[PDB]
Design a protein around this ligand. Structure first.
Ligand SMILES: *[C@@H]1O[C@H](CO)[C@@H](O[C@@H]2O[C@H](CO)[C@@H](O)[C@H](O)[C@H]2NC(C)=O)[C@H](O)[C@H]1NC(C)=O
Ligand SMILES: *[C@@H]1O[C@H](CO)[C@@H](O[C@@H]2O[C@H](CO)[C@@H](O)[C@H](O)[C@H]2NC(C)=O)[C@H](O)[C@H]1NC(C)=O
Ligand SMILES: *[C@@H]1O[C@H](CO)[C@@H](O)[C@H](O)[C@H]1NC(C)=O
Ligand SMILES: [Fe+3]
Ligand SMILES: [Zn+2]
Ligand SMILES: [Zn+2]
Lengths: 6, 335
């Protein structure tokens, strides 16, 4: 439930 | 107009993409990366335009800003008068498949068995079965649930990669691309067919398309459906004819993603390219078929009848569906 993984 | 730069995952997809590029008169051209996450990073950098993705990968891409453009549509189970491009997609069935001869095995006795997965982070191979297992065990320790696995993309020295076999030389063990013998739908079903694993997490279509002469490949050519069973969540085992009542979930179809600013152009080019190379395309089979592979399911699944328009210009969360998104997000809390 957060940001881009890169 | 501009060229569309596709991103191929591994060298077998790159070969296919280079054939498409030649046949397309360079309307499509190719970039290639070793993994699907690396292709998503080329697209986020603007060094590729698009690729077609399993829904679990659509979630990674979507979190990074990429949008769904067109979805795979396979032959419909019901009659429809709509053209393929305008027919609503139906979602595929994620299933757990075992051998009938392995008589003791049910969903409730999976602990400490040997498993075959398409790849980490994919829908039927990983997010659906591991999400159900973490939930039913109440534990994030899913990397210790099966005794050994082939789960391409995991740590190659770990038990999640112990069953993976790499390429003809045994290099690239556990890489999440088609060089790994047990990658993907067909590789994970081969892991089960060869009794490397006890269970394969694939989709319904994979068991049908690799049995009873539907595949002429050596390891498949002699497989019979009746030698496999599906594991139902209520602990029963059924024949593989019963997938509509013995699946783990319904998955959103693989789909093409791009940056938002390139979506429209990628869409227009793809609609044209499948008119030339798609099923019943003008130049398929004479010259090139976009939805067939030298090996298996390269760029697109070989059971794709067309890429279809999406309804409602959907965000990635609308395309995947709220329930699937929430399941992925719950599982990713373990990592
Ligand atoms: C499980 O998958 C198989 C393979 O895609 C489906 O069987 C195909 O169904 C189509 C559309 O009905 C038929 O016209 C094809 O000939 C079938 N293929 C084969 C190889 O038999 C099957 O319908 C799917 N089961 C469920 C419940 O969705
Ligand atoms: C694993 O369990 C979690 C926790 O219950 C599930 O998350 C819920 O899913 C339902 C249906 O989408 C929602 O109404 C709830 O809001 C979700 N709860 C929470 C706390 O996030 C999740 O669906 C389960 N995973 C799988 C694969 O079934
Ligand atoms: C290349 O794209 C241009 C512009 O759409 C079009 O005129 C031409 O037909 C395309 N050719 C092929 C082979 O895809
Ligand atoms: Fe998938
Ligand atoms: Zn269901
Ligand atoms: Zn919307």
């Amino acid at each position: 439930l957060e940001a881009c993984a890169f | 107009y501009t060229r569309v730069v596709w991103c191929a995952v591994g060298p077998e997809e790159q070969k296919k993409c280079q054939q498409w590029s030649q046949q397309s008169g360079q309307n499509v051209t190719c970039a290639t990366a070793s993994t699907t996450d690396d292709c998503i990073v080329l697209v986020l950098k603007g060094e590729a335009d698009a690729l077609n993705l399993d829904g679990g990968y659509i979630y990674t891409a979507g979190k990074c800003g990429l949008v769904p453009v067109l979805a795979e549509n396979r032959k419909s189970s019901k009659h429809s008068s709509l053209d393929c491009v305008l027919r609503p997609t139906e979602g595929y069935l994620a299933v757990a498949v075992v051998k009938k001869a392995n008589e003791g095995l049910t969903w409730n006795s999976l602990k400490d068995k040997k498993s075959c997965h398409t790849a980490v982070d994919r829908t039927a191979g990983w997010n659906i079965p591991m999400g159900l297992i973490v939930n039913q065990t109440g534990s994030c320790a899913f990397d210790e649930f099966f005794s050994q696995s082939c789960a391409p993309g995991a740590d190659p020295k770990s038990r999640l990669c112990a069953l993976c076999a790499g390429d003809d030389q045994g290099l690239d063990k556990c890489v999440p691309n088609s060089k790994e013998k047990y990658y993907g739908y067909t590789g994970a079903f081969r892991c089960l067919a060869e009794d490397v694993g006890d269970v394969a997490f694939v989709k319904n279509d994979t068991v049908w398309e690799n049995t009873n002469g539907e595949s002429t490949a050596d390891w498949a050519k002699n497989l019979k459906r009746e030698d496999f069973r599906l594991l139902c969540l209520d602990g029963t085992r059924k024949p593989v004819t019963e997938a509509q009542s013995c699946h783990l979930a319904v998955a959103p179809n693989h789909a093409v993603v791009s940056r938002s600013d390139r979506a429209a152009h990628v869409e227009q080019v793809l609609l044209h390219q499948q008119a030339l190379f798609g099923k019943n395309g003008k130049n398929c089979p004479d010259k090139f078929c976009l939805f067939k592979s030298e090996t298996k399911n390269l760029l697109f699944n070989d059971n794709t009848e067309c890429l279809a328009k999406l309804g409602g210009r959907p965000t990635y969360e609308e395309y995947l569906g709220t329930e699937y998104v929430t399941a992925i997000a719950n599982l990713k809390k373990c990592s």
